[PDB]
């Protein structure tokens, strides 16, 4: 099976229908306050009506805030869109960071569309290029045969298809996408070592139009419009060949796109589905980023945002003198929820250790479990988790299967924690 | 009926289909030809 | 339920201006209440905008955070209505690597202004069922002379029986916009367009500047085209072939502007074709951007001198109750008035934002309770599970050691 | 001056420069959009003349290599997973492939049996994928067509394999499906029954 | 041959027995036996390849083989497994954001192996006839077992006539591709005419049946797939390295498609290994970004090296152990290296002398070992070849301790250089 990461055990928030947090469920423990709060938030987004609300998490480092976001995603299913990122990626060498944030917000939302589409394929019978415009193409298929006018654009496409007759093609009127499928299977015997392959005549009508539940983000709508790879005019082609550099997108484009999407919704064909945006290490953002967040969260179309930080009241990035709680400016802090996190005790450590051991499926002595819980009490939890694989390797190499205290101590003197290094540095 | 489909081939039903991309309609902008009537002193 | 792109907004409630016809305040209407002095000042400024006889006047709105100056600005914007240009942009959008700095502010200004123009065009059609000249018609038929592109194009055109697009009789262009008068089942009009100088300049800049509009790519258009187009606009104004409708502009968080920005603003305001401008900022005495100078709101003294100010004041208790009830009905949530009172208290101690936040959480909690009316118990539980600024600051201060750098 | 040794492979295990390209390239954009077209009332004929002159200039200049340029920057719009899917679709085709390879090693003409009409088309896909011969037997064909097909089979030994319509000479066939009516080769029935699909062929009674 | 005797050429592995006990000498290595144990465990776990995202750091005195340990690891790993070593200063670039650079390195480290069946024939060019008018063609081939005769395809005709193959040659053609390849001429093929033409060797006639099917396997890295499909003719940029801001939607699309290809036996992934040197050269931004860069499943194990102690965090004023924020520190484990002992130094220098192929006196060994111990090992390593050159200038073979003293006097060392700079402080400006 695919590899297993640290945050793989997580599968669900572990709440109960009543709205409470079961002590042991879906790979979670303790922090009933946080678990029920996440329940409230997931219900809020399930409302699918509120827009612009935002929340933040905090607490001791390595308490699973990332795990909480992941579990929210787990219980959210797949239909709703989702997007992670970090403060570091905001800095770019292509466009301003404001535009990076706005692009993120645009792609947080999702869209779903039911689309017509009209196709044309068959076996090429003839190709009469009467007067360019009058390019009639005769197509043969098991159902029968037809011949229809053509667009000189598709004429050039066919030219470039290297197709004459007795071969299979595939034409879509909307995109005008032109394509070949090798040669017909009728000519499977003329020669013996002719290179090109063969496929049989289509078993359906030349014409067919089928609907499809397509889904796209508003970000992709904007970007697809911005740089018109579509079209075929030579001026457009030349515009395409130029280097693909991403550019800041004018907001008038945004407004027109919003209007057109409103029209599409009024057609009843398309239905909207907002997403949730998760941002990690928000403290890494500068003062300008928070300044623009102030306005960005105001929009009537902004999806729900989440944050994360593991820092005290320290200096503010891009500010270098003011200190604010968690480093986030107090003004922006005024605009957000707050959800905290506790610390743990040895028993919870034993519980989570059992969970992880099952996750990677390793037999272990209960004494080793006790000693490892003691170590975690002394050290950080992440340090305790990291010891599992070396212990397993020690067990396997020596031929035994379950882990014992001897292997635990062996790993102990093999590797040391940060504080151990510091005291010996 | 539904025994033989799976017993022989699942593609016999729900035939695998090749995806594609959306062909958005073109974008238009109203204006007046007067934008160019002048600016050509000559 | 069915939703448009927009949804419940943080400041959706407002729809206009709670102003009397005599530019006087009515205590509560249009989704806003209180702050009567700012209300009258904003009415005066909006009247200035309507008149538009003066050129490029500037105003600033101060006040401690929380006082919804953005609310006032959005109320102004609604009051203007969808007939005059209005531009709103925060302070950080100004820094863009694509173009230089002064260029970005100059483009902003030239975008804010607006030029209107109406035009006419005669277009008539005949009900031609056959798609092939023989301009089949039911009102009055024409066999007028035949072109070439029209002949080779309309013949192969795909159209339903009796359908009649509003084709250009005056020209013949295939304009597939109109419908059939009666076959399937004329007005020169005054086509009115709105345009800004940022549109005219980019359109004339190159062969396809309209592409650059959407692409947001063009940078540093030479000032020569700018001045020439200004001359062209003026000489169209004089001849009556065109008219101007001076728009407006809004900026936010001007405290986050460089000193060079303020100097360029001081120059540019002096110009003639400057749309009216509005500002926004909260802090009091603060350091200016780029140096150690402490200045009122961190704005250069000279720029302040050539600018006016209007202040706001906190909300009293009953003001808070009024705002709470209006936003509670806005969200369509119904409370027990004891809940109203306890929540109003809490909001007074903590903040306005905290209450505007708690309302929806309480609504959802009650939905889980399956009731329709929320009481104090639910609010207390919600406030227990989530924290405000002060409570979180404290809780850190107990765990200060855990959190790094503290 | 002109070393131009060669465009070395990018560590593609020997062959390279096309197989990696056509094996990896699959991306499709979610959306494709046309260029925006400005809407103006009657425009000046002078701008029209200048832009049309530009439209003339662009070609001829591009004409000689306009074609070569046009093959490129035409982003793929869709794909078609091959019968490699058959891997995860039906164990029948994958499991028989080995014995069909054995038969091709031997060299007997092989007629194949089945009942579903569409399974014939799928098996035709299979045949094409393995690069073997074929001949289709259906029921829409008339009797003279049936006998002409038999004549094609017998007169021509070039073909190697054939498919029979369940309705109604060589020495290689194997059953495929089940039915109720009566109408040295080894017949390895297409029974992928590791479950009740065995009893499914055993009794065939009212119960 | 392009290689040359390098400082770390003497390394050939790690010298660990099956139970991972290091051997006091093996494939050019000895010392830091605890470090050798830990490294053996790491290599074993890499072979297991059942887990992702693990990270480890190596700290110790400078010039104590940390790079040597890493290179022995890389050697023992083998070429099949992808590997990549980079320097901290290298990410800082004027073409891309740092985060994009880190993503590029990560994706480079991981590799993918593609398997696919083949279908080909090969044999002598027994005879060919082409019949230009289209062109009619007839041809035959054979092998060491039998012979056959076939028609000729029109596109086959163009292919071969461009190939201009000579009858009697040995070649192989794939039906689907229809691309031919010459695999070496044969006795009759290169028997040629009376006319000179050319001269060439021969190859043995092929064997087995013409048709052979056969399976081919390939390998490529994730970043390579990203780049090749990114710009649609961004392929040539692979060498130019001009790729910029490879978008995220592309990343996720590739991840989805590769996963689905994976679980269907189409191909097999392989968890590569990535090593970064002078990790302290990273700022706080890179620490933040990579801190989460380990959760993504496609996470090759990371190895870091740095000798600092309680140093200012790059880009700020915060002292931290080795200048790495504690958030990362708790996410990884450490290994320490001790300064070497006396006799082990003798062994190391003898190994390096063997490397250089210069064999000299025992008193020279004693004196040089003591001098290097007092000053540093690296200065001794420098003096090795210098003494070799001096002795060869003497025209003898055995280097003598007097020659060692001569060369030592010739090339002042660090301590002597600072002592000199002291001898005249005002010699050089800005003191
Ligand atoms: N209920 C839980 N069960 C198991 N592990 C947990 C739980 N809560 C937190 N963790 C641990 O927290 C770690 C993730 O920490 P992380 O979220 O990155 O730190 P922070 O919470 O400061 O962002 C994981 O290794 C996970 O094992
Ligand atoms: N009555 C209100 N209605 C809406 N928003 C308010 C109200 N009072 C305070 N605020 C909000 O408090 C935030 C910080 O206050 P302040 O900056 O003074 O307001 P503004 O953003 O309007 O300048 C503002 O974003 C504003 O939206
Ligand atoms: N125990 C050893 N065995 C063999 N060679 C060694 C040993 N220790 C050091 N060396 C040699 O000395 C060098 C030590 O440099 P190193 O400490 O790795 O540099 P850095 O401090 O940059 O990591 C290595 O390149 C290696 O060639």
Swiss-Prot record, chain A:
InterPro entries: AAA+_ATPase (IPR003593), P-loop_NTPase (IPR027417), RuvB-like (IPR027238), RuvB-like_C (IPR041048), RuvBL1/2_DNA/RNA_bd_dom (IPR042487), TIP49_P-loop (IPR010339). One of its GO terms (biological process) is telomere maintenance. Ubiquitously expressed with high expression in heart, skeletal muscle and testis. ATP binds at residues 59-66. Pfam families: TIP49, TIP49_C. It catalyses: ATP + H2O = ADP + phosphate + H(+). Transmembrane segments: none annotated. GO terms for cellular component: centrosome; ciliary basal body; cytosol; dynein axonemal particle; extracellular exosome; Ino80 complex; membrane; MLL1 complex. Its EC number is 3.6.4.12. It comes from the Eukaryota. It is found in: Nucleus matrix; Nucleus, Nucleoplasm; Cytoplasm; Membrane. High level of autoantibodies against RUVBL1 are detected in sera of patients with autoimmune diseases such as polymyositis/dermatomyosistis and autoimmune hepatitis. Possesses single-stranded DNA-stimulated ATPase and ATP-dependent DNA helicase (3' to 5') activity; hexamerization is thought to be critical for ATP hydrolysis and adjacent subunits in the ring-like structure contribute to the ATPase activity. Component of the NuA4 histone acetyltransferase complex which is involved in transcriptional activation of select genes principally by acetylation of nucleosomal histones H4 and H2A. This modification may both alter nucleosome-DNA interactions and promote interaction of the modified histones with other proteins which positively regulate transcription. PANTHER family: RUVB-RELATED REPTIN AND PONTIN (PTHR11093). Binding to MYC is dependent on a Myc domain essential for oncogenic activity. This is RuvB-like 1. It comes from Homo sapiens (Human).
From Swiss-Prot, chain D:
Residues 92-207 form the Helicase C-terminal domain. It is found in: Nucleus. Ubiquitously expressed. Component of the NuA4 histone acetyltransferase complex which contains the catalytic subunit KAT5/TIP60 and the subunits EP400, TRRAP/PAF400, BRD8/SMAP, EPC1, DMAP1/DNMAP1, RUVBL1/TIP49, RUVBL2, ING3, actin, ACTL6A/BAF53A, MORF4L1/MRG15, MORF4L2/MRGX, MRGBP, YEATS4/GAS41, VPS72/YL1 and MEAF6. May also participate in the formation of NuA4 related complexes which lack the KAT5/TIP60 catalytic subunit, but which include the SWI/SNF related protein SRCAP. The NuA4 complex interacts with MYC and the adenovirus E1A protein. EP400 interacts with TRRAP, RUVBL1 and RUVBL2. Component of the NuA4 histone acetyltransferase complex which is involved in transcriptional activation of select genes principally by acetylation of nucleosomal histones H4 and H2A. This modification may both alter nucleosome - DNA interactions and promote interaction of the modified histones with other proteins which positively regulate transcription. May be required for transcriptional activation of E2F1 and MYC target genes during cellular proliferation. Belongs to the SNF2/RAD54 helicase family. SWR1 subfamily. This is E1A-binding protein p400. The lineage of its organism: Eukaryota, Metazoa, Chordata, Craniata, Vertebrata. The gene is EP400. The chain holds residues 1808 to 2038 of 3159 of the full protein.
Swiss-Prot record, chain E:
Changing residue 277 to N: Abolishes ATPase activity. Transmembrane segments: none annotated. The modification Phosphoserine is found at residue 415. There is a cross-link at residue 422 (Glycyl lysine isopeptide (Lys-Gly) (interchain with G-Cter in SUMO2)). GO terms for molecular function: ADP binding; ATP binding; ATP hydrolysis activity; ATPase binding; beta-catenin binding; chromatin DNA binding; DNA helicase activity; identical protein binding. One of its GO terms (biological process) is DNA repair. Changing residue 278 to Q: Reduces ATPase activity. Decreases interaction with NOPCHAP1. No effect on formation of RUVBL1-RUVBL2 heteromeric complex. Pfam families: TIP49 (PF06068), TIP49_C (PF17856). The keyword Nucleotide-binding applies. Its main location: nucleus. It is an enzyme of class 3 (hydrolase). Keywords: Acetylation, Activator, ATP-binding, Chromatin regulator, Cytoplasm, DNA damage, DNA recombination, DNA repair, Growth regulation, Helicase, Hydrolase, Isopeptide bond, Membrane, Nucleotide-binding, Nucleus, Phosphoprotein, Transcription, Transcription regulation, Ubl conjugation. SMART domains: AAA (SM00382). GO terms for cellular component: centrosome; ciliary basal body; cytoplasm; cytosol; dynein axonemal particle; euchromatin; extracellular exosome; Ino80 complex. InterPro entries: AAA+_ATPase, P-loop_NTPase, RuvB-like, RuvB-like_C, RuvBL1/2_DNA/RNA_bd_dom, TIP49_P-loop. ATP binds at residues 60-67. The keyword Transport does not apply. It catalyses: ATP + H2O = ADP + phosphate + H(+). Its EC number is 3.6.4.12. Forms homohexameric rings. Can form a dodecamer with RUVBL1 made of two stacked hexameric rings; however, even though RUVBL1 and RUVBL2 are present in equimolar ratio, the oligomeric status of each hexamer is not known. Oligomerization may regulate binding to nucleic acids and conversely, binding to nucleic acids may affect the dodecameric assembly. Interaction of the complex with DHX34 results in conformational changes of the N-terminus of the RUVBL2 subunits, resulting in loss of nucleotide binding ability and ATP hydrolysis of the complex. (Microbial infection) Interacts with Mumps L polymerase; this interaction regulates the viral transcription. The C-terminal domain is required for association with ATF2. This is RuvB-like 2.
């Amino acid at each position: 099976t695919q590899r297993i990461a640290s945050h793989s055990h997580v599968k669900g928030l572990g709440l109960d229908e009543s709205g409470l947090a079961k002590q042991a469920a879906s790979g979670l423990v303790g922090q009933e306050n946080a678990r029920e709060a996440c329940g409230v938030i997931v219900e809020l987004i399930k409302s699918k009506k509120m827009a612009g609300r935002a929340v933040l998490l905090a607490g001791p480092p390595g308490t699973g805030k990332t795990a909480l976001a992941l579990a929210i995603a787990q219980e959210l299913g797949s239909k709703v869109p989702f997007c992670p990122m970090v403060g570091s990626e905001v800095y770019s060498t292509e466009i301003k960071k404001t535009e990076v944030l706005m692009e993120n917000f645009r792609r947080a939302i999702g869209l779903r569309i039911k689309e017509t589409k009209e196709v044309y394929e068959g076996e090429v019978t003839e190709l009469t290029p009467c007067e360019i415009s009058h390019v009639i193409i005769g197509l043969k298929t098991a159902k029968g045969t037809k011949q229809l006018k053509l667009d000189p654009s598709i004429f050039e496409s066919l030219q470039k298809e290297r197709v004459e007759a007795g071969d299979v093609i595939y034409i879509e009127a909307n995109s005008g996408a032109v394509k070949r499928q090798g040669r017909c299977d009728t000519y499977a015997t003329e020669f013996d070592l002719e290179a090109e392959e063969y496929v049989p005549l289509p078993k359906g009508d030349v014409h067919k139009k089928k609907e499809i539940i397509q889904d796209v983000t508003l970000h992709d709508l904007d970007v697809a419009n911005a740089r018109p790879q579509g079209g075929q005019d030579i001026l457009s082609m030349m515009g395409q060949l130029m280097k693909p550099k991403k550019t800041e997108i004018t907001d008038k484009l945004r407004g027109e796109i919003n209007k057109v999407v409103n029209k599409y919704i009024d057609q009843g064909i398309a239905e909207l589905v907002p997403g949730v945006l998760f941002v990690d290490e928000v403290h890494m953002l500068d003062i300008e980023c928070f300044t623009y967040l102030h306005r960005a969260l105001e929009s009537s179309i902004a999806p729900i945002v989440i944050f994360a930080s593991n820092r005290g009241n320290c200096v503010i990035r891009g500010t270098e003198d003011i200190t604010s709680p968690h480093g986030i400016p107090l003004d922006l802090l005024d605009r957000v929820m707050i959800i905290r996190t506790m610390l743990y005790t040895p028993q919870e450590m034993k519980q989570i250790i059992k969970i992880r051991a099952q996750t990677e499926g390793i037999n272990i002595s209960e004494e080793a479990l006790n000693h490892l819980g003691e170590i975690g009490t002394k050290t950080t939890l992440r340090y305790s988790v990291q010891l599992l694989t070396p212990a397993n390797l020690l067990a396997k190499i020596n031929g035994k299967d379950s882990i014992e205290k001897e292997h635990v101590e062996e790993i102990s003197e093999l590797f040391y924690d940060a504080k151990s290094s510091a005291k010996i540095l | 009926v539904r025994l033989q489909r799976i017993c022989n081939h699942p593609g016999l039903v729900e035939p695998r289909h090749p995806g594609s991309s959306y062909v958005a309609g073109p974008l238009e902008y109203p204006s007046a030809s007067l934008i160019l009537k002048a600016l050509e002193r000559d | 339920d069915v939703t448009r792109i927009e949804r419940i907004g943080a400041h959706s409630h407002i729809r206009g201006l709670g102003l009397d016809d005599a530019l006087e305040p009515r205590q509560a209407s249009q989704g806003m209440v209180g702050q009567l002095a700012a209300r009258r000042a904003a009415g005066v400024v909006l009247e200035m905008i309507r008149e538009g006889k003066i050129a490029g006047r500037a105003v600033l709105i101060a006040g401690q955070p929380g006082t919804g100056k953005t609310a006032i600005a959005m109320g102004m914007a609604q009051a203007l209505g969808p007939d005059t240009p209005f531009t709103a942009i925060a302070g950080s959008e100004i820094f863009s690597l694509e173009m230089s700095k002064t260029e970005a502010l100059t483009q902003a200004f030239r975008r804010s202004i607006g030029v209107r123009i109406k035009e006419e065009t005669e277009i008539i059609e005949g009900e031609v069922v056959e798609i092939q000249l023989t301009l089949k018609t039911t009102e009055m038929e024409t066999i007028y002379d035949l072109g070439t592109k029209m002949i080779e194009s309309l013949t192969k055109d795909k159209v339903q029986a009796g359908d009649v697009i509003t084709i250009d009789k005056a020209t013949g262009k295939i304009s597939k916009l109109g419908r059939s008068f009666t076959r399937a089942r004329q007005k020169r009009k005054e086509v009115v367009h709105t345009v800004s100088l940022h549109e005219i300049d980019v359109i004339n800049s190159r062969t396809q500047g309209f592409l650059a509009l959407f692409s947001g790519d063009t940078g540093e258009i030479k000032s020569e085209v700018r001045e020439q187009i200004n001359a062209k606009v003026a000489e169209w104004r004089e001849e009556g072939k065109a008219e101007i409708i001076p728009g407006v502009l809004f900026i936010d968080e001007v405290h986050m502007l460089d000193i060079e920005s303020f100097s360029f603003l001081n120059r540019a305001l002096e110009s003639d074709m400057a749309p009216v401008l509005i500002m926004a900022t909260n802090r009091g005495i603060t350091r200016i951007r780029g140096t150690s100078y402490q200045s009122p709101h961190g704005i250069p003294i000279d720029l302040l001198d050539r600018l006016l100010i209007v202040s706001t004041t906190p909300y009293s208790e009953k003001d808070t109750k009024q705002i709470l009830r209006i936003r509670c009905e806005e969200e369509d949530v119904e409370m027990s008035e004891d809940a109203y009172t306890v929540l109003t208290r809490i909001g007074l101690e903590t903040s306005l934002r905290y209450a505007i936040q708690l309302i929806t959480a309480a609504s959802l909690v009650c939905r889980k309770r399956k009731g329709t009316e929320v009481q104090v118990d639910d609010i207390k539980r919600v406030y227990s599970l989530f924290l405000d600024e002060s409570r979180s600051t404290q809780y850190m201060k107990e765990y200060q050691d855990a959190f790094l750098f503290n | 001056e002109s070393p131009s040794e060669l465009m070395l492979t990018l560590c593609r295990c020997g062959e390279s420069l096309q197989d990696v390209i056509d094996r990896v390239a699959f991306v499709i954009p979610p959306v494709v959009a046309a260029p925006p077209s400005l809407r103006v009332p009657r425009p000046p004929p002078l701008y029209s003349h200048r832009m049309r002159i530009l439209r003339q200039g662009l070609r001829e200049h591009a004409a000689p290599y306009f074609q070569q340029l046009r093959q490129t920057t035409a982003p793929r719009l869709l794909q078609f997973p091959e019968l490699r899917l058959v891997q995860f679709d039906s164990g029948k085709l994958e499991a028989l492939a080995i014995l069909l390879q054995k038969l091709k090693s031997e060299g007997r003409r092989v007629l194949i049996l089945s009942q579903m009409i569409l399974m014939l088309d799928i098996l035709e896909m299979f045949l094409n994928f393995h690069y073997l011969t074929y001949v289709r037997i259906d029921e829409n064909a008339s009797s003279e067509q049936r006998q002409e097909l038999m004549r094609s089979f017998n007169r021509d030994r070039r073909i190697f394999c054939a498919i029979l319509s369940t309705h109604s000479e060589a020495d290689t066939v194997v059953f495929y499906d089940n039915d109720l009516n009566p109408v040295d080769i080894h017949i390895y029935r297409l029974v992928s029954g590791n479950s009740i699909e065995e009893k499914l062929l055993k009794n065939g009674t009212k119960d």
